[PDB]
Structure formats: C-alpha cells, structure tokens
C-alpha cells in the first residue's frame, strides 16, 4: 500500500509560478529516488526533474533548468517542484514517479506513480 498523492496544480498566466507537492506513504521514503514527469495530451510522457534519496543529487530537463527547482523533505515524506517563469510550453499533467535507490530517468523505470495534477498556462 504505497501511495503518492499530488497537489499544487491549476491555472496560471504566463510568467507565473506554481509549487507542486507529492506526499508519499507506505514504503520508506528515503530509499526512493523521486522524479517529476509531464504529459501533454497526445505527446509522450517526458522527464522534467529528478532527485536522489538524500536530496543532494538533482537533474533537470535542459528546457526547464533554472526556471524549475526540485527538492524534498525526508522528514515529512514529500517532494516539491517549484515552477517559475511558466511558458505555454509547460502546460500538461505533471506526474510524480518513485523508483528504489536511483531516480527514474525514463517512464518504464518508475515503480510507483501519483494520480497526476494538471497545470495550465494561458497567455
């Protein structure tokens, strides 16, 4: 009974900001590498950002690097994605994926998913 529950999405104007959260419960959180994926309707689900178990190692999709920040609080079992300078490009459903020991970099590698939270960026 491992469950990932997401929040913080919704609608915002271009240049705006959001903060996604993904609270985990069931397994031991620090043994999982957490990753944010996003999927626009009709396109393939793509990698956005990933963080290691300890929280030291972070990787970003080149596009969103600088604008997006991933982080995690291993005490409260949550991973965050702070989005800034949002473009219409970034409109999609954002999913949080967990994989044991090493963050997933491709969809197939993810062991546990969240329900997915919509982000829409109008202009």
Q: What whole-number distance in Å separates Cα of residue 3 and Cα of residue 70?
A: 20
In terms of residue numbers, what domain contains 115? Answer: 3-121
Asked whether the beta carbons of 54 and 71 are under 8 A apart, the reply is no
In terms of Cβ atoms closer than 10 Å to its own Cβ (0-12, 13-18, 19+), residue 67 is middle
CATH value at residue 76: 2.60.40.10
Residue whose C-alpha is closest to residue 96's, from 42, 14, 25, 43: 25
How many domains, in total, are found in the chain?
1
> Could you tell me if 91 and 121 are in contact, meaning their C-beta atoms sit under 8 angstroms apart?
yes
Listed resolution, Å: 2.7
* Residue 10 burial (10 A CB sphere; 0-12, 13-18, 19+): exposed
């Amino acid at each position: 009974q491992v469950q990932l529950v997401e929040s913080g999405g919704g609608l915002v104007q271009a240049g705006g900001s959001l903060r996604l959260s993904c609270a985990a419960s069931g397994a031991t959180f620090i043994t999982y590498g957490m990753t944010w994926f996003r999927q626009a309707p009709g396109k393939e689900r793509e990698f956005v950002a990933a963080v290691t178990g300890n929280g030291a190692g972070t990787t970003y999709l080149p596009s969103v690097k600088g604008r997006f920040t991933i982080s995690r609080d291993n005490a409260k079992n949550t991973v965050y994605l702070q989005m800034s300078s949002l473009k219409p490009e970034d409109t999609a459903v954002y999913y949080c994926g967990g994989r044991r020991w090493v963050p997933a970099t491709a969809v197939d590698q993810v062991a546990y998913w969240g329900q997915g939270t919509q982000v829409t960026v109008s202009s």
